[PDB]
Amino acid sequence: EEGRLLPAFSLHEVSRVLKDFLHDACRGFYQWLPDLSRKSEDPWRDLFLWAVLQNRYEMATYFWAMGREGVAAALAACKIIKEMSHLEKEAEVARTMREAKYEQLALDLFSECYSNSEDRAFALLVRRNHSWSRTTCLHLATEADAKAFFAHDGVQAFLTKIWWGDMATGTPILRLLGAFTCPALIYTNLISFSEAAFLLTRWRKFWGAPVTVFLGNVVMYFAFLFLFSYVLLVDFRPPPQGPSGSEVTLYFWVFTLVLEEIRQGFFTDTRLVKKFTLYVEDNWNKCDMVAIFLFIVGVTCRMVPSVFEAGRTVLAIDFMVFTLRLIHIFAIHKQLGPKIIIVERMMKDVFFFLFFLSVWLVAYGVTTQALLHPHDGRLEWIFRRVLYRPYLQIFGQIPLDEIDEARVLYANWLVILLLVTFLLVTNVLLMNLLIAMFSYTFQVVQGNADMFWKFQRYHLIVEYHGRPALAPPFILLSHLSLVLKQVFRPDPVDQKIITWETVQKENFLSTMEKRRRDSEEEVLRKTAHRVDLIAKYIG
Amino acid sequence: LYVEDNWNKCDMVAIFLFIVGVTCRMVPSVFEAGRTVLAIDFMVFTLRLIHIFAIHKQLGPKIIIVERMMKDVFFFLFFLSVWLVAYGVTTQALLHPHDGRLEWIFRRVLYRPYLQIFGQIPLDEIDEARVLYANWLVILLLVTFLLVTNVLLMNLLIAMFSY
Amino acid sequence: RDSEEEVLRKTAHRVDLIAKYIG
Amino acid sequence: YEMATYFWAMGREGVAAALAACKIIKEMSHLEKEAEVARTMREAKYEQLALDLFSECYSNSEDRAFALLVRRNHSWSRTTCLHLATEADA
Ligand SMILES: [Ca+2]
Ligand SMILES: [Ca+2]
């Protein structure tokens, strides 16, 4: 009905709703109508789609059992099933729709392929899939948000192997740090290296790894952070030219940084609105953008010498933001990652707890004010006292100074009782409500924690892999080279892989069936039927 | 095999410290620093006294547990100290314009985060400074600290502890 | 030997043999 | 595995051999070229059989069990049981 502006709809509308579900995955399905008498190009896939759309599980499983390119289809089906759960009109059907469980079959099959010939499993995982409009498996895995699939051991092994590039090895951390510190030690055999121009290629293969680029970027970031702290500490001078030197240096640094950020956010694209949405998707980019906004406000400060102080405070806030951004490295470490994710998860309820505690604080302060003394000549001093008292509760200083003076004694005991009630109920709740959800996310959501950590690992890895192969200063030269290049401008092993995949799938299915066959309950059922038949035939 | 044991390793480092103390006793001009070295060596010898706690059935497993959970606490302290420093540097700009002597600033900026655990909260300079826009930011940052550190230092700890 | 699963397996084999021999 | 278990069932000086086998199995896990074989290699579980047998001997005549535990083992080049237990980090 919307497009037009024995049922009427044809295969055109089916292709349209499919593209609506998956844009880059299956945009070209059923290329307006062709000749109906023509045979199908890939029958099993079409039947699989028709089955899974009508929410007919067993039919879909069977159709999948007779088709090629298994894991890709299994992930796409999970995507479509999870999609057709919010658009459901009946909650009864919505529950069973949300009970699809295709990702389980996908992971099971992929484990079966990974068990043997993992060297081919890795090729499959990045192989182009022919039926689904030339789309890689990881793209579908991402579009389906299949966190469970990433958590697979083979996926993590592939991530690790890509994390070290061609120079992969065991590579102890200290040995790597030393080899990076000693530019000549790399030519020696300090670590294993996989297979005038020779030394150039060797150094290229060295710096091309992701780990070394990550270390270099974190070193440069830490160094620039320290240097900016220095320039803000002592070089915050009047607007003569000399003081502005370090300032314009930091300005150029921030310019290169924001250029690299906008490149990583906008050229990593169908539409400009698509690039904007995907850039706004990440929260790290969000704090990056707010930090650049704060730095712009600081530049506006540097423009005007009359409001230099408030703008110095703005620069201080921007530095606080840049320092908060330094926690980005804690996710990569196996010991620090999950802890950081846990701390991130438990950040919601603590805010409301602080809100309630502050509300209670204020009521106590206002009450104490009436009982403290009659009126006040200056609001300021009262502001200082009434602010410091509840703020010092955590401190434990308990400066009942004014109260002692006031007694010189009926308002003291009420204050003591209220402070005791606070130091008990807050002390209790702040860990009681905390430990429950903490152990929850740690054990019952241990899977959630590990999965989120592995997901962030994959994201960081794929982000740093495409990182520019140059210094952030030289990144300008890289962009210029790209713009200049823009202005100036197999099959048989694939069939072997496909046959191997189908064979492994058939073997896995047969093994699952045979294992189900000899279960105890099936044995009792069969023996019961048999003894009943024997008893009937005998009499 | 001798280097395999860690107890022998601290034994050897203690003998090294005692050798440095002997070298001190050789020279009367550097007697003070060497007295500090002897103090450190005595601290090491005293730390070695925990060796007996392993034999007792009640103290042994507890000592082993304390030994096991000694890795993550170091990185936690590292992160906490990093956060401490950023807050201190920020507060410095908002505190006041420049500084005539680095020393006093060193004492203040060291004592403040060190006193957070203490709870003394010597916002003395801040009170003087107001004589008032930098105070509330300091209070908010100290509250954020005394909540998030208080939370994590037992949240991340109890999981691995019960583990 | 005398585990429950082994008992069920043996009894199943036995009843199957009996059913085959009888008919 | 099964061949090794059977061969062990027909031999003397049990627990010493059972610990030495665990040592060798744990050793031949880092020197493996294929992770698939490495997993099942690391799934050896000989120390379980060693401990089970030693418990069986300890159940009766512990006065002799203690002698066995420090006895010299003839086949393994005159080596005590505890030495193998240590070298295997059992
Ligand atoms: Ca960014
Ligand atoms: Ca010693």
Interface with A, mutate which of D36, D37, D39, D40 (most A CBs under 10 A): D36
Rounded distance between C-alpha atoms, residue A257 and residue A234, angstroms:
23
Beta bridge partners of A136: A128
Torsion of CA A264, A265, A267, A271, to 10 degrees: 170
Interface with A, mutate which of B85, B142, B151, B152 (most A CBs under 10 A): B151
Expressed in angstroms and rounded, the spacing between residue B55 Cα and the centre of ligand 2 is 16
Tokens (6 digits) for D44: 């050896």
Residue A394 · residue B119 · CB < 8 Å: yes
User: Which residue has 């150094």 as its token pair?
Assistant: A203
Q: Which of A465, A459, A479 is nearest to A260 (CA)?
A: A479
Rounded distance between C-alpha atoms, residue B52 and residue B60, angstroms:
9
A-chain residues near D36 (CB < 8 A): 115-116, 118
Q: Which residue of B has its CA nearest to A321?
A: B86
The resolution in angstroms reads 3.8
Rounded distance between C-alpha atoms, residue A71 and residue A79, angstroms:
12
Rounded distance between C-alpha atoms, residue A406 and residue A503, angstroms:
89
| Distant-in-sequence, close-in-space partners of A487: CB < 8 Å, separation ≥ 6 | none
Q: Which of A62, A105, A54 is nearest to A84 (CA)?
A: A54
The number of beta carbons lying within 10 Å of the beta carbon of residue B119 is 13
DSSP state for residue A26 in the 8-state scheme: S
Cα B137 to Cα A231, A317, B84: the distances in Å are 22, 10, 14
Rounded distance between C-alpha atoms, residue A114 and residue A281, angstroms:
33
**DSSP secondary structure letters along A136-205:** EHHHHHHHTT-HHHHTSHHHHHHHHHHHTGGG-S---HHHHHHHHH-TTTTTSSSS-----HHHHHHHHH
Rounded distance between C-alpha atoms, residue A173 and residue A186, angstroms:
14
Rounded distance between C-alpha atoms, residue B127 and residue B107, angstroms:
17
A-chain residues near C22 (CB < 8 A): 534, 537-538
Half-sphere exposure for A420 (CA within 13 Å, toward CB):
6
**DSSP secondary structure letters along B32-43:** HHHHHHHHHHHH
Residue A364 · residue A425 · CB < 8 Å: no
Nearest-CB residue to B119 (from A234, A397, A438): A397
Rounded distance between C-alpha atoms, residue D3 and residue D67, angstroms:
30
Residue B2 · residue B11 · CB < 8 Å: no
3-class DSSP assignment, residue C20: helix
Residue B153 · residue A434 · CB < 8 Å: no
Rounded distance between C-alpha atoms, residue A257 and residue A291, angstroms:
11
A-chain residues near B79 (CB < 8 A): 327, 330
Expressed in angstroms and rounded, the spacing between residue B25 Cα and the centre of ligand 2 is 25
E strand or H helix that includes residue A107: helix A103-115
Counting CB pairs under 8 A, whether chains A and B reach 3 or more, is yes
Beta D72-73 vs A135-136: how paired, if at all? unpaired
The number of beta carbons lying within 10 Å of the beta carbon of residue A123 is 13
Query: Subunits with at least 3 CB pairs below 8 A relative to chain D?
Result: A
Residue A24 · residue A278 · CB < 8 Å: no
Half-sphere exposure for A438 (CA within 13 Å, toward CB):
20
First-residue to last-residue Cα distance in chain A: 67
Pinpoint the alpha helices (H) of A396-445: 401-407, 412-439
Rounded distance between C-alpha atoms, residue A240 and residue A75, angstroms:
63
First-residue to last-residue Cα distance in chain C: 30
Q: Which of B91, B159, B79, B162 is nearest to B126 (CA)?
A: B91
Tokens (6 digits) for A537: 């035939």
Tokens (6 digits) for A26: 């299956």
Rounded distance between C-alpha atoms, residue D80 and residue A208, angstroms:
54
User: Which residue has 């956010």 as its token pair?
Assistant: A265
3-class DSSP assignment, residue A129: strand
Q: Which amino acid is at B25?
A: R
A-chain residues near D35 (CB < 8 A): 118
User: Which residue has 């027909």 as its token pair?
Assistant: D10
Tokens (6 digits) for B82: 């990093």
B-chain residues near A394 (CB < 8 A): 119, 142-143, 146
Contact B93 A431 (CB under 8 A): no
**Cα of A101 vs its chain's centroid, Å:** 23
Residue A311 · residue A298 · CB < 8 Å: yes
Beta bridge partners of C20: none
Rounded distance between C-alpha atoms, residue A157 and residue A118, angstroms:
10
Chain B residues touching chain A at CB-CB below 8 Å: 71-72, 75, 79, 82-83, 86-87, 89-90, 92-94, 98, 119-121, 130, 132, 135-136, 139, 142-143, 146-148, 150-152, 154-156, 158-159
The number of beta carbons lying within 10 Å of the beta carbon of residue A144 is 24
The number of beta carbons lying within 10 Å of the beta carbon of residue A82 is 17
| Distant-in-sequence, close-in-space partners of B23: CB < 8 Å, separation ≥ 6 | B34
Residue D13 · residue D75 · CB < 8 Å: yes
The three-point CA angle A176-A179-A181 to 5° equals 110
Q: Phi/psi at D72 (nearest 5 deg)? A: -75, 135
Q: Which of A360, A434, A234, A227 is nearest to A242 (CA)?
A: A234
Expressed in angstroms and rounded, the spacing between residue A299 Cα and the centre of ligand 1 is 21
**Cα of A456 vs its chain's centroid, Å:** 4
Rounded to a whole number of angstroms, the CA Rg of chain D reads 14
Rounded distance between C-alpha atoms, residue B162 and residue A449, angstroms:
18
| Distant-in-sequence, close-in-space partners of B48: CB < 8 Å, separation ≥ 6 | B7, B10, B11, B14
Q: Phi/psi at A136 (nearest 5 deg)? A: -80, 160
SS3 content of chain A, % helix, strand, coil (to 5): 75, 0, 25
Q: Which of A364, A371, A378, A381 is nearest to A406 (CA)?
A: A371
Tokens (6 digits) for B160: 């691995």
Interface with B, mutate which of A317, A323, A329 (most B CBs under 10 A): A323
| Distant-in-sequence, close-in-space partners of A191: CB < 8 Å, separation ≥ 6 | A167, A169, A170, A171, A175, A176, A179
Q: Which of A43, A115, A106 is nearest to D34 (CA)?
A: A115
Half-sphere exposure for A88 (CA within 13 Å, toward CB):
19
Q: Which of B73, B15, B14 is nearest to B47 (CA)?
A: B14
Q: Which region holds residue A365: left if phi is over 0, alpha if psi is between -120 and 50, else beta?
A: alpha
Tokens (6 digits) for B104: 């006093």
DSSP state for residue A456 in the 8-state scheme: H
D-chain residues near A115 (CB < 8 A): 36
Q: Which of D25, D47, D50 is nearest to D38 (CA)?
A: D25
Half-sphere exposure for A253 (CA within 13 Å, toward CB):
17
Contact A534 C12 (CB under 8 A): no
Residue D32 · residue D38 · CB < 8 Å: yes
Q: Which of A420, A411, A431, A373 is nearest to A393 (CA)?
A: A420
Residue A141 · residue A75 · CB < 8 Å: yes
Rounded distance between C-alpha atoms, residue A325 and residue A284, angstroms:
8
Residue A349 · residue B88 · CB < 8 Å: no
Expressed in angstroms and rounded, the spacing between residue A265 Cα and the centre of ligand 2 is 59
User: Which residue has 């620039």 as its token pair?
Assistant: A224
Half-sphere exposure for A422 (CA within 13 Å, toward CB):
24
E strand or H helix that includes residue D80: strand D79-80
Query: Subunits with at least 3 CB pairs below 8 A relative to chain C?
Result: A
Q: Which of A161, A206, A152, A214 is nearest to A460 (CA)?
A: A214
Can you point out the beta strands (E) in A56-131? 128-129
Residue B12 · residue B45 · CB < 8 Å: no
DSSP state for residue A444 in the 8-state scheme: I
Rounded distance between C-alpha atoms, residue B139 and residue A133, angstroms:
58
Tokens (6 digits) for A333: 């470490």
Rounded distance between C-alpha atoms, residue A20 and residue A14, angstroms:
10
Expressed in angstroms and rounded, the spacing between residue A284 Cα and the centre of ligand 1 is 6
Per-residue three-class SS string for D19-77: HHHHHHHHHCCCCCCCHHHHHHHHCCCCHHHHHHHHHHHHHCCHHHHHHHHHCEECCCC
Method: cryo-EM
Nearest-CB residue to C23 (from A523, A527, A537): A537
Q: Which of A362, A429, A424 is nearest to A391 (CA)?
A: A362
Q: Which of A149, A150, A179 is nearest to A164 (CA)?
A: A179
Q: Which residue of A has its CA nearest to D39?
A: A115
Tokens (6 digits) for A381: 């001093």
Contact C8 A534 (CB under 8 A): no
The full length of chain B comes to: 163
Residues in chain D after which the chain is broken, C→N over 2.5 Å: none
Torsion of CA A138, A142, A145, A146, to 10 degrees: 10
